[PDB]
Design a protein around this ligand. Sequence first.
Ligand SMILES: C[C@]12CCC(=O)C[C@@H]1CC[C@@H]1[C@@H]2CC[C@]2(C)[C@@H](O)CC[C@@H]12
Lengths: 11, 250
Amino acid sequence: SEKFKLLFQSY
Amino acid sequence: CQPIFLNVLEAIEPGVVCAGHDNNQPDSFAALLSSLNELGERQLVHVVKWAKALPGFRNLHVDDQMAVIQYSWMGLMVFAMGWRSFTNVNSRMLYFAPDLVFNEYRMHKSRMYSQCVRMRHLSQEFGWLQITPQEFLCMKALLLFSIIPVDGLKNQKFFDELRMNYIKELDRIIACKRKNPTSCSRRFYQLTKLLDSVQPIARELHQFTFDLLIKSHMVSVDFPEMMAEIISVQVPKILSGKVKPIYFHT
Ligand SMILES: C[C@]12CCC(=O)C[C@@H]1CC[C@@H]1[C@@H]2CC[C@]2(C)[C@@H](O)CC[C@@H]12
C-alpha cells in the first residue's frame, strides 16, 4: 500500500 | 434530548457518485466491469472521507485506520448499493450508480450473475425487514469495524472499544420507540443476521475481482490504480484466511 496512503493522508 | 450520533452519520453520508459509463454503447463484459472498477475507485474516495469523519475514528492508530478501510470497502459498498437499489428502484434492479443500473441481462453479461442475485436478495431485505434510514446508517458504519486480521491490529484495544460503542448506538436506535426488551432482542437478531449475510457476498466478490485482476490484460478489463493495488495487496490476505470477518452468529 502506497497510493491509498496518499489518498488517506490528504483526506 | 437530541441524537448526536445519528446527526453525524446523517451529515457525513456521501452524495450520489457516478460511474462515467457510456450507456449509448451496447453492453459488453469488458466495458461493464471496467466501469464497475472505475466506480469502485471513485467510491473509495468518498468512503475515506466518510470514515475519517466518523465518531471516534481518529482515535484508531493511523495504520489501523487505513487497514479497516482496505478490508471492508467491499462490504460497505455492497451494503450501500443494496440500499440505493431498494430506495431508488424498489429492488427491481441493482442501482450501482445512476448511470450504471443492472437488469438481469446485465447481471448475466457481467459474468457474476449469481453474486448479483445475492445482492438483489440483500436489497429486498431492506424491504421485508423494514430497515429504517437510521438503522441503515448505523449498520453501514458498523461494517467498517467488521473485518479484522488474525494477527491483530496495531492497537487492537482501541478498535474493540470503538466497535463496541457503535453496537451500543445500534442498541439505542432499536430501543427507540420499542418499550419491550423482547422486540428489542428480536430486532437485534434480524439486523445482525442481515449484517452477516453481507460477508459471504463480499467474499464471493473478493474472489471474483481477484481472478479478474490476474487475467485483466487478457479480457481487456481496466483496473484503476488504487483498485489494482488494494486487490493485489489487501484482498489476497482476506482470501488466504489471514484476515477474517467478525460474525455475530455461527
Ligand atoms: C464495489 C463495486 C462498486 C461500488 C458498488 O456500488 C458495489 C460494487 C460491487 C461489485 C464490485 C464493484 C467494484 C469493482 C469490482 C470489484 C469488480 O472488479 C468485480 C466486483 C466489482
